[PDB]
Design a protein around this ligand. Sequence first.
Ligand code: ZN
Length: 130
Amino acid sequence: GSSGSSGENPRNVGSLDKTSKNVGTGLVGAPACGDVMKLQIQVDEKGKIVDARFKTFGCGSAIASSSLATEWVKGKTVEEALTIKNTDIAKELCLPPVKLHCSMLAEDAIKAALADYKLKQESKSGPSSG
Ligand SMILES: [Zn+2]
């Protein structure tokens, strides 16, 4: 419910150097539920995900979907992740139709990661700094 409890600490939650390029950054939260899913994966020279970190803030459904998602990107390549869909996730966690926002949240995070990382590969410098 609204009153978020403090406990059941997550696992493997440690954002990566967002100041680098080899590691993309994907942050996707929920406007209604009010969540903050910060995903970050480190891509090697070959283009394979060697490191993956997820950080969810809000409802559990989000923390779970992520923890599981970020675990699927590990060992896989940026290309593979792009294939990863939310439908499967929702089923894996077996979340209700009310906590769907989370399911999609995971996928959105994954892509944002690889994508953002690619943007730097295609454009070293640009008019935007952010
Ligand atoms: Zn939520």
